[PDB]
RNA sequence: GCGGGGUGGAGCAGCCUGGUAGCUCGUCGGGCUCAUAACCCGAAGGUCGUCGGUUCAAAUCCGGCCCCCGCAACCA
RNA sequence: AAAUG
RNA sequence: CCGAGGGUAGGGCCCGUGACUGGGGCGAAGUCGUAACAAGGUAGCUGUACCGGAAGGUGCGGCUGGAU
RNA sequence: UGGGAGAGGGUGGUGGAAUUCCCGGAGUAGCGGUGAAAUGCGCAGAUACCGGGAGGAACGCCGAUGGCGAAGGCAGCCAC
RNA sequence: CGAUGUCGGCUCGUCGCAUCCUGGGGCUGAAGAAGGUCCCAAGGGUUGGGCUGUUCGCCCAUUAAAGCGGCACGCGAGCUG
RNA sequence: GAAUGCCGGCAUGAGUAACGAUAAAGAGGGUGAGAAUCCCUCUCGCCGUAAGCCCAAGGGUUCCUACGCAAUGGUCGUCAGCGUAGGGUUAGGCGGGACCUAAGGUGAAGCCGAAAGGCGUAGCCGAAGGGCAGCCGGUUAAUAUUCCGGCCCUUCCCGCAGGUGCGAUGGGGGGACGCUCUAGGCUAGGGGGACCGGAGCCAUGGACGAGCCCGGCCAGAAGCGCAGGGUGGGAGGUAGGCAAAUCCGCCUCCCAACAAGCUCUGCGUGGUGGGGAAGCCCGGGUGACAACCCCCCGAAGCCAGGGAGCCAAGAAAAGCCUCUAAGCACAACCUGCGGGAACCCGUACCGCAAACCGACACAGGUGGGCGGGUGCAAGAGCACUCAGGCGCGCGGGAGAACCCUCGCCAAGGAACUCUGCAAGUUGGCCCCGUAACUUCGGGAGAAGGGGUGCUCCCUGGGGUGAUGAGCCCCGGGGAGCCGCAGUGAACAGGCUCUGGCGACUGUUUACCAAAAACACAGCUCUCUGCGAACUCGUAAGAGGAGGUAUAGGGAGCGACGCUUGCCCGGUGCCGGAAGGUCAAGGGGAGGGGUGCAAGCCCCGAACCGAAGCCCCGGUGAACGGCGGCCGUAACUAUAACGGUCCUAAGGUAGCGAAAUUCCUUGUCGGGUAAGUUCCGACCUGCACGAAAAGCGUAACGACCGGAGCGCUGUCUCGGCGAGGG
RNA sequence: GAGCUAGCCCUGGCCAGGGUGAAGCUGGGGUGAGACCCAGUGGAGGCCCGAACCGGUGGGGGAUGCAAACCCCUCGGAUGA
RNA sequence: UGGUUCGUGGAGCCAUGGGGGAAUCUGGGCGGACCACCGCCUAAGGCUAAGUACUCCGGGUGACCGAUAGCGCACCAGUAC
């Protein structure tokens, strides 16, 4: 549901922005926010560990409840849907009958003013969270705990989702957004449905400005450097690579598998990612 | 043209100051070297 | 200046490791067809650019000359 | 399999 | 004041013209293929699409103006 | 007004046969293909045969010279 | 080589003669006009433009003629770059 | 005697360059041994979004007074930021601290490291952020919101009265926030006034005037008034805010909802307290019992935490309020009054500069506030000018060449030249009018014209007010006057046609290149399933990310349009429980040393033995590569066809003497009087070619070429004039 | 040694004036209902002209300079990377 | 692996990160692979003066210098700058 702009400035020709339709509240909840310290890609040492980051617009971090097994069997009314600059997903404010208020990621189709609840006996209804072993096979799901009681780690980005393909032993088998098939323990909680704001990938930035507003500093090619700086550097005039395309550090960047082999999670992965 | 020296009394004291020298084995050695030579001021002065 | 090449009519093997020149097309003769090509059966034709040398013996190994491509000609 | 006059 | 007209500037249509180029028309016996009329020897044609020295071949779908 | 038929259309849901791929069992000298071969495949264990799984596409018989729509077109099954 | 600034142009000249003009001649297949070739002769003169960084050259319009060369491929403690 | 030797000293250049902006000087009168340079006065010039005034940073006595000139000052010097001596900086309310936190720093706990040390939650430090109580006037040679005068205000201690469940480092609220535009109502400030106050003045032809000139305010407690901000009230239930809890949150009922009320500011008024000129007279005194009013313009500031809109989604803690817990309710808190208390450091002066950063009294650099009046459309622009501040610390003469900077030119108008380099032309507002092409916005201020001053008459509308006048802001029509010229001076685009490149605004070699290079959205590959991959670090630990495949790292290409063909033989990567190879180790056939011997010690085959390599496959938007010779058409010329050797496979589309073409100024056409450049074609591409992308593309460009018009001292071709040398 | 320079983090400040006129909203037309068309309000933008402020395109001067990178004319961005 | 003259050398001895892991005298280590003989010494706990090293400090003495030497400083020096 993306909006465009007439090309009255050359950078405005192709720009696109989200409709912001489902957003019902212009400001967050004071009690649930805290300061997001901008790292600038630099660590405690001061060194840059990730290049070309920083300079983005100032943001206030919004605390999210990635553990709904916290408050089992206590329902809540969907209070509002807000905009979070800290992730690709919209979020929804919850007013529990318990009085406590919490944010969760806003799944697709979640309409304001409805009941949501978490528990092994919670109904199969968009927004409700259950352990995996108690969710019907095949249903879409998201906000999946990778391991029990360690916080939802999977399917949090805008429009993402995870499917249930079967059960084996205590574990259940999922199809993650990447296509990978992995045994996940049944006691891992997960929120049913698909993440909202699915049109996020159709956003056309438009100009270099929006790269900076988000905190993405200009990224400079390797071939545009000198020998000391990058392997591709140097050369009289323009020049092709002349070696297997390599990261600034030497390891190749064309189909080099990086995952550690003897990783114990290998036992629990069924299918490497597709495509 | 803007030249290399733009004095700041807070900076000169936090950088070359006496309490700064004591905090590193290098700076401690800095003081020991200057006392053995017998300099009249171990630290740059600043009025604060 | 440096490298490769020249052999039936055309395009290439043989030259490295001397003694014996071969592959495809083509040409010629005869077959099938009404006739041509295609196709089948036969056949002829090369003294290896040239000259000199070595050797019992040179397409072949070594020299000089002609021609044929190809590479180089940078710092000023 | 299989062209042309 | 108007005003033939003259000058300046930018537009519109038409005619002629032009290195080069595109196909097209015709022009007794040039070259290379044989796609169509027999089931033309892969049924023909068509719209569309990609490819091929050339006619044309193939894919999807449609027609019978297709024979047995 | 009361009734009848029908692949007429749109959405959602759903069934089995079959093809390929993966996992398991069993098993061995070829499979596949054509006018006849060859490329491909196969002891690194294929074809053929059993069990399990994933995924897409199309709906056998019924079915027709049949029906519906203005036309192009429309065919598993349930519902709105 | 503890430095002799390197093309071309502008500016400013000056010299040499194997002379392009102008002057004085011999021969001529010199009728005249006009040329050809050679001899003497350097006093003075020797245009403007197009293109190219160009020297050179080509071309336009003239001309009495549009000469060749030396002076660190004259001349950067004079310039351009 | 040499080492472009070391140290020191004195020459040479040379009385030559220079005396640090071309904003400018003259005269008179003082003092003194001495004066263009010090002081006083008059005359003249200069800045005036400053070259004026107030802060902050930095500097450290340079401020003021007296006495002095050897040196310092680019000359002189009586002068001075210099020398000597004395004097000078006053705070509960301004700033900082005894309050709070942010990045960050430190760091009980805890983790890590040969040592030194490195991390790390709470805590603590850390400000130009939050919070916090003072305004006006006077005075000193020098300080003042600090002393003094008037009118206000805070906290702490004690005492007293009244009120209430009091009590916190623990709970909750609040503090609490972005960018753009913006309503209303005020204030700052400014303009005018025939109204009020005023010393005077009549000039030189006129004016005794509704004339000229000066001035016509500042602060202010309670109360009042105008304008805004903020907040709903009660009852019941309660499992949440890590104890509790009436507070908060959630649910239900009742009343109120642009309101009202209650509460906080801002402005006006306000007892009362100060200020108060020109001019004249010697910083003071008068003027003066000074007056102190009316109208208009009006903020970017105040009400403020206002309102709307948008995407990139916009600090924390404390003060403050409330809630309760131990405790304690003889208390304690709150409100009010009375009486006492109120500490440390900074205050001078410079502060766009001669006192700071540049070695100098340096034409450079330095953040924040005020920054007046008129006119020009406007404005912090330009020009003139107020208050205020300077003429830049060598002058005086002469009137050559030459350089700098500026002004003018006959006729010609790019002939100059690598190139119109430079200098001209154009120039602001109004109205008419404006092409290809295009991504429909654009191109476009395209181009190119006309108007523009002043006076008289008529007339519309808005603001203020009241509806009128007055003042103010926008225009409309008619008739006329002057000059060469009407945005009359200063500030202010030359334009058009056509190519190459890069899409675009942007970025860089501070200090010779701003570009065609980088970046950029956008495309594609590839990696990573979370304690991610990658990165920094020995580690701990961080970053990634309090992110989760619509996310994150890496590589190339670089909007968008139309597209991106063939080769996997070699290299790289991905896949491949077979085989081959393979070290340690296992293994110990078989030997050896020595002992009389039990024994001790060493060597040691086959066979078992990972990754890696060979080997089988896959892979191009992975590294890379994409043929030669020969024949042939009813003229010739050329080959759509054919022949042959080779390759892993032989360059497809599109373009092409190009940012690439050696031969080259290829050939033909255009443009020109003439065109080695430019433009269009041709193609035998020495040696373009498809993501080191290929061909195009509207718009954009201080990029690089070619052309024309306009105008010119660039030139023929030079001449005069001005100023600083 | 980051008091110059480069990048980032925390916290404050600055950008006169003018011009162009996107979406949206209201109205009207239209339609079966729509899309859409027109006038008005509206005030978007790595938009335009142009001071401050940040730059350093072209030329000239300066070259033992005022200056170890300056001065004059000219020129770019100037609500955004 | 390190030390020793010992750089894998026939490489012991001393020390030791990893692994396996005894004995109490008839036990144990060394005599340069290893064996036997013959000898030496008793590991895995600790302390121990004097003889030796240096010269900020005090003194004595120089075929040591004499203000560009001699300490950088004879003097108000680790100062001015
Ligand atoms: Mg640090
Ligand atoms: Mg580096
Ligand atoms: Mg490298
Ligand atoms: Mg390279
Ligand atoms: Mg390069
Ligand atoms: Mg190259
Ligand atoms: Mg790696
Ligand atoms: Mg310095
Ligand atoms: Mg600074
Ligand atoms: Mg400071
Ligand atoms: Mg002392
Ligand atoms: Mg020969
Ligand atoms: Mg012979
Ligand atoms: Mg034929
Ligand atoms: Mg007329
Ligand atoms: Mg006319
Ligand atoms: Mg085909
Ligand atoms: Mg009916
Ligand atoms: Mg199987
Ligand atoms: Mg096979
Ligand atoms: Mg087999
Ligand atoms: Mg019908
Ligand atoms: Mg010399
Ligand atoms: Mg030289
Ligand atoms: Mg002579
Ligand atoms: Mg002669
Ligand atoms: Mg001659
Ligand atoms: Mg003559
Ligand atoms: Mg003659
Ligand atoms: Mg030439
Ligand atoms: Mg000439
Ligand atoms: Mg000459
Ligand atoms: Mg020469
Ligand atoms: Mg050059
Ligand atoms: Mg130049
Ligand atoms: Mg000597
Ligand atoms: Mg010298
Ligand atoms: Mg010398
Ligand atoms: Mg003299
Ligand atoms: Mg001289
Ligand atoms: Mg002189
Ligand atoms: Mg002089
Ligand atoms: Mg001047
Ligand atoms: Mg005087
Ligand atoms: Mg003077
Ligand atoms: Mg100070
Ligand atoms: Mg005095
Ligand atoms: Mg003096
Ligand atoms: Mg003094
Ligand atoms: Mg006070
Ligand atoms: Mg105290
Ligand atoms: Mg604190
Ligand atoms: Mg500790
Ligand atoms: Mg420590
Ligand atoms: Mg630390
Ligand atoms: Mg503050
Ligand atoms: Mg204060
Ligand atoms: Mg003062
Ligand atoms: Mg005062
Ligand atoms: Mg007082
Ligand atoms: Mg109680
Ligand atoms: Mg209480
Ligand atoms: Mg709190
Ligand atoms: Mg207002
Ligand atoms: Mg005014
Ligand atoms: Mg007034
Ligand atoms: Mg007045
Ligand atoms: Mg009066
Ligand atoms: Mg008179
Ligand atoms: Mg006056
Ligand atoms: Mg008042
Ligand atoms: Mg109110
Ligand atoms: Mg209520
Ligand atoms: Mg209650
Ligand atoms: Mg409760
Ligand atoms: Mg509780
Ligand atoms: Mg309650
Ligand atoms: Mg209450
Ligand atoms: Mg008031
Ligand atoms: Mg009086
Ligand atoms: Mg009087
Ligand atoms: Mg008003
Ligand atoms: Mg402001
Ligand atoms: Mg405000
Ligand atoms: Mg607001
Ligand atoms: Mg915090
Ligand atoms: Mg605290
Ligand atoms: Mg109690
Ligand atoms: Mg002061
Ligand atoms: Mg300045
Ligand atoms: Mg200032
Ligand atoms: Mg001064
Ligand atoms: Mg001066
Ligand atoms: Mg200065
Ligand atoms: Mg100075
Ligand atoms: Mg103003
Ligand atoms: Mg003004
Ligand atoms: Mg004005
Ligand atoms: Mg006027
Ligand atoms: Mg000005
Ligand atoms: Mg004045
Ligand atoms: Mg001043
Ligand atoms: Mg002065
Ligand atoms: Mg004149
Ligand atoms: Mg002239
Ligand atoms: Mg003229
Ligand atoms: Mg002209
Ligand atoms: Mg010329
Ligand atoms: Mg040009
Ligand atoms: Mg040039
Ligand atoms: Mg120019
Ligand atoms: Mg046109
Ligand atoms: Mg238009
Ligand atoms: Mg115009
Ligand atoms: Mg006039
Ligand atoms: Mg082109
Ligand atoms: Mg070109
Ligand atoms: Mg660009
Ligand atoms: Mg540079
Ligand atoms: Mg990108
Ligand atoms: Mg994709
Ligand atoms: Mg590491
Ligand atoms: Mg780690
Ligand atoms: Mg982490
Ligand atoms: Mg990515
Ligand atoms: Mg590129
Ligand atoms: Mg490109
Ligand atoms: Mg490709
Ligand atoms: Mg390959
Ligand atoms: Mg390969
Ligand atoms: Mg592999
Ligand atoms: Mg072994
Ligand atoms: Mg024996
Ligand atoms: Mg292996
Ligand atoms: Mg290759
Ligand atoms: Mg022929
Ligand atoms: Mg081609
Ligand atoms: Mg090629
Ligand atoms: Mg193609
Ligand atoms: Mg190119
Ligand atoms: Mg031509
Ligand atoms: Mg022509
Ligand atoms: Mg021309
Ligand atoms: Mg050129
Ligand atoms: Mg050619
Ligand atoms: Mg290329
Ligand atoms: Mg290439
Ligand atoms: Mg490529
Ligand atoms: Mg192109
Ligand atoms: Mg392109
Ligand atoms: Mg296009
Ligand atoms: Mg273009
Ligand atoms: Mg630009
Ligand atoms: Mg141009
Ligand atoms: Mg001139
Ligand atoms: Mg002159
Ligand atoms: Mg003069
Ligand atoms: Mg450090
Ligand atoms: Mg910095
Ligand atoms: Mg300002
Ligand atoms: Mg504005
Ligand atoms: Mg503006
Ligand atoms: Mg405005
Ligand atoms: Mg406007
Ligand atoms: Mg306009
Ligand atoms: Mg609106
Ligand atoms: Mg409407
Ligand atoms: Mg509109
Ligand atoms: Mg408007
Ligand atoms: Mg401009
Ligand atoms: Mg601008
Ligand atoms: Mg600056
Ligand atoms: Mg820069
Ligand atoms: Mg410049
Ligand atoms: Mg220059
Ligand atoms: Mg210089
Ligand atoms: Mg400018
Ligand atoms: Mg622009
Ligand atoms: Mg910004
Ligand atoms: Mg060793
Ligand atoms: Mg060795
Ligand atoms: Mg040895
Ligand atoms: Mg050893
Ligand atoms: Mg023992
Ligand atoms: Mg012992
Ligand atoms: Mg000694
Ligand atoms: Mg001694
Ligand atoms: Mg002596
Ligand atoms: Mg003596
Ligand atoms: Mg000495
Ligand atoms: Mg002496
Ligand atoms: Mg001496």
Author numbering:
A (entry chain 1D): 2 to 276
B (entry chain 17): 1 to 48
Pull text from the paper.
During protein synthesis, ribosomes discriminate chirality of amino acids and prevent incorporation of D-amino acids into nascent proteins by slowing down the rate of peptide bond formation. To provide structural insights into the poor reactivity of the D-aminoacyl-tRNAs in the peptide bond formation we determined the crystal structure of T. thermophilus 70S ribosomes in complex with hydrolysis-resistant analogs of aminoacyl-tRNAs. We used cytidyl-cytidyl-puromycin (CC-Pmn) as an L-aminoacyl-tRNA analog that carried L-methyl-tyrosine residue (L-mTyr) and adenyl-cytidyl-cytidyl-adenylyl-D-phenylalanine (ACCA-D-Phe) as a D-aminoacyl-tRNA analog that carried D-phenylalanine residue (D-Phe).
Here, we need to note that the ribosome structure in complex with A-site CC-Pmn has been reported previously at ∼1Å-higher resolution. The only reason why we determined it again is to validate the accuracy of our structural models determined at 3.7Å resolution. For this purpose, we compared our 3.7 Å-resolution structure of the 70S/CC-Pmn-complex with similar or identical structures that were determined previously at 2.4–2.8 Å resolution. Our comparison revealed no significant differences in the location and orientation of the CC-Pmn molecule on the 70S ribosome between the new and the previous structures. In all analyzed structures, the L-mTyr was tightly fit into the A-site pocket due to shape complementarity between the ribosomal A-site and the amino acid backbone. This similarity of L-mTyr conformation in different crystal structures illustrated that, despite limited detail, our 3.7Å-resolution maps allowed reliable model building, which was due to (i) the strong signal from bulky aromatic side chains of amino acids, (ii) chemical restraints used during real-space fitting and model refinement and (iii) limited volume of the A site pocket that leaves A-site substrates little freedom to move. Our electron density maps revealed that, in both crystal structures, the CCA-ends of aminoacyl-tRNA analogs establish canonical contacts with the A-loop, illustrating that the presence of D amino acid residue does not impede recognition of the CCA-end by the ribosome. In case of L-amino acids, the α-amino group (such as the one in CC-Pmn) forms a hydrogen bond (H-bond) with the 2′-hydroxyl of the nucleotide A76 of the P-site tRNA (black dotted line), which plays critical role in (i) its positioning for the optimal nucleophilic attack onto the carbonyl carbon of the P-site substrate and (ii) the subsequent shuttling of the protons (solid arrowhead).
